[PDB]
């Protein structure tokens, strides 16, 4: 399993740095390596669970399209097919986004492995703390995607219940809400891909500069990628605030639909749609 061998090598290298730091006496490097190696384990475990929920979402959206076609409602089946296609495009973008983030971590840890092996302990500590911030930022993106997945799953359940209850207006309005949530996630993936590629370029500068002996250039480039990751985290914190404001609206739509007040549930999903379109 190539998806399993690359992760094992990443964790093995960092754990090897922690053992070498302890025998040499650098506990700051040891505690930084041990914590970074653990953050990678949690990012891998959280990534595996994130992949399963996304597959589950795609099955549900496709399941609705096949069911709505058999029940006669064709306009809802086309809307679910359009929603499913964008969910697939969103997942494929996340795959390339994940593939570039993994390369980010590998390059940084390669800098840390070479810096610690060549004696530059201050450069090795700088690389490991940048690697940890990159993993922490990735975990914050994984948790945020899971929050987005929950928004989609709740909306998909409303559309299925409304479809089986003959409430096509609420079913179409829900799928449209789930549709915009996927479009908003796509636009966030596009802007993130532009940032991650920019960070890859800067990290390749530090790796080559260290191998060629430009230590001052290597530290400044590695330092530049650190604040780029930190600046990206601060911007993502604001996006998390809006999503929580959307989840509260979906809970109002859930409670209005289960209690029969369908007019309040439609107004709630409509207000949530305007907020989603404004996010990105």
């Amino acid at each position: 399993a190539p998806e399993e061998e690359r992760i094992k090598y990443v964790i093995t290298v960092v754990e090897q740095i922690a053992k070498d730091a302890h025998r040499n006496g650098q506990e700051e490097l040891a505690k930084l390596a041990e914590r970074t190696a653990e953050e990678a384990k949690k990012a891998t475990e959280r990534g595996e669970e994130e992949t399963l929920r996304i597959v589950y979402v795609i099955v549900v959206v496709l399941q609705i399209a096949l069911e709505a076609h058999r029940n006669g409602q064709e306009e809802l089946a086309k809307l679910a097919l359009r929603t499913a296609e964008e969910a697939i495009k969103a997942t494929e973008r996340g795959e390339e986004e994940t593939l570039r983030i993994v390369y980010v971590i590998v390059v940084v840890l390669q800098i840390a492995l070479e810096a610690h092996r060549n004696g530059q302990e201050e450069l090795a500590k700088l690389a490991l703390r940048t690697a940890e911030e990159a993993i922490k930022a990735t975990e914050r993106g994984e948790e945020e995607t899971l929050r987005i997945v929950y928004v989609i799953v709740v909306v998909l359940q409303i559309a299925l219940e409304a479809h089986r209850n003959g409430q096509e207006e609420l079913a179409k309005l829900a799928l449209r809400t789930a549709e915009e949530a996927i479009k908003a996630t796509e636009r966030g993936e596009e802007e993130t891909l532009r940032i991650v590629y920019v960070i890859v370029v800067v990290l390749q500068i530090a790796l080559e500069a260290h191998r060629n002996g430009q230590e001052e250039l290597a530290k400044l480039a590695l330092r530049t990628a650190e604040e780029a990751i930190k600046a990206t985290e601060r911007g993502e914190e604001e996006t998390e605030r809006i999503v929580y404001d959307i989840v509260v609206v979906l809970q109002e739509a859930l409670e209005a639909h289960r209690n029969g007040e369908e007019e309040r549930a439609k107004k709630a999903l409509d207000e949530a749609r305007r907020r989603i379109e404004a996010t990105e």
Side-chain angles (χ1 to χ4, degrees), residues 70 91 104 106 115 130 150 190 205 212-213 215-217 220 222-223 235 259 268:
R70 297 167 181 172
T91 309
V104 162
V106 171
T130 57
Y150 173 83
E190 296 294 332
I205 302 167
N212 298 331
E215 299 297 330
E216 185 61 30
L217 177 60
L220 293 170
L222 187 51
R223 180 75 181 275
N259 284 284

Side-chain angles (χ1 to χ4, degrees), residues 71-257:
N71 292 258
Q73 187 57 62
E74 282 297 327
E75 298 189 348
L76 190 69
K78 295 165 56 187
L79 180 56
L81 285 178
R82 187 174 67 180
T83 302
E85 182 172 3
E86 294 158 335
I88 294 177
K89 292 301 183 300
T91 309
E92 291 176 337
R93 290 283 74 192
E95 295 177 358
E96 297 297 326
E97 176 177 339
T98 304
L99 185 58
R100 295 184 183 182
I101 291 178
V102 173
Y103 186 77
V104 162
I105 303 176
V106 171
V107 170
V108 175
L109 294 178
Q110 190 61 252
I111 298 176
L113 179 61
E114 297 178 9
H116 175 70
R117 194 181 179 273
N118 290 124
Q120 288 94 2
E121 301 296 336
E122 187 69 20
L123 179 62
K125 295 180 182 177
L126 172 58
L128 269 183
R129 68 190 191 100
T130 57
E132 179 182 19
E133 285 303 315
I135 300 175
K136 289 185 181 299
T138 303
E139 295 178 337
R140 296 178 178 179
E142 294 179 324
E143 302 289 342
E144 187 62 23
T145 303
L146 292 162
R147 284 183 281 265
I148 295 177
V149 168
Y150 173 83
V151 160
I152 298 175
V153 172
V154 163
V155 170
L156 293 178
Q157 295 298 328
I158 301 180
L160 186 59
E161 294 175 356
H163 173 67
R164 298 174 179 177
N165 292 347
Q167 298 162 339
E168 294 306 328
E169 181 177 356
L170 185 64
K172 295 176 61 178
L173 180 55
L175 279 187
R176 194 178 182 180
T177 301
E179 178 183 18
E180 297 295 332
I182 302 175
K183 285 181 163 71
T185 303
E186 292 179 338
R187 297 187 296 268
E189 291 173 325
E190 296 294 332
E191 186 169 16
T192 302
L193 277 168
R194 147 183 178 274
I195 297 177
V196 174
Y197 168 80
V198 149
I199 300 178
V200 173
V201 175
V202 183
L203 292 171
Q204 293 177 342
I205 302 167
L207 182 56
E208 296 181 1
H210 169 259
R211 294 176 179 177
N212 298 331
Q214 295 94 37
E215 299 297 330
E216 185 61 30
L217 177 60
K219 293 184 297 179
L220 293 170
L222 187 51
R223 180 75 181 275
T224 303
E226 185 174 23
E227 294 298 329
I229 294 175
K230 293 181 176 181
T232 309
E233 296 178 352
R234 305 183 186 96
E236 287 188 353
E237 294 173 359
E238 167 65 22
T239 65
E240 300 192 2
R241 184 64 178 174
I242 305 180
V243 167
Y244 288 131
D245 204 356
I246 301 177
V247 173
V248 183
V249 182
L250 269 62
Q251 292 301 137
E252 295 183 10
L254 272 179
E255 189 69 18
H257 174 66

